[PDB]
Amino acid sequence: MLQKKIEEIAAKYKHSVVKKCCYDGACVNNDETCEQRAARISLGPRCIKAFTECCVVASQLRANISHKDMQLGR
């Protein structure tokens, strides 16, 4: 599951673009500051909470495991 709970919340967005936003969120740079690590969340509004959210849930998916769940579920 390199993106199961995140590809699901991404696809269930009321905005095709929010999909990419959550895409990075799950692929967050490393810690909390996801797009923040990027440089400055400046790709859109739905992004801020879309990516931030997918990156936070992804944050808990990768902040506790380190295998199928982490390596994949992230």
UniProtKB/Swiss-Prot annotation:
Residues 15-44 are annotated as: Involved in C5AR1 binding. Glycans are attached at residue 64. Disulfide bonds join 21-47, 22-54, 34-55. Residues 21-55 form the Anaphylatoxin-like domain. It is found in: Secreted. Mediator of local inflammatory process released following cleavage by C5 convertase. Acts by binding to its receptor (C5AR1 or C5AR2), activating G protein-coupled receptor signaling and inducing a variety of responses including intracellular calcium release, contraction of smooth muscle, increased vascular permeability, and histamine release from mast cells and basophilic leukocytes. C5a is also a potent chemokine which stimulates the locomotion of polymorphonuclear leukocytes and directs their migration toward sites of inflammation. This is C5a anaphylatoxin. The lineage of its organism: Eukaryota, Metazoa, Chordata, Craniata, Vertebrata. The gene is C5. The chain holds residues 679 to 751 of 1676 of the full protein.
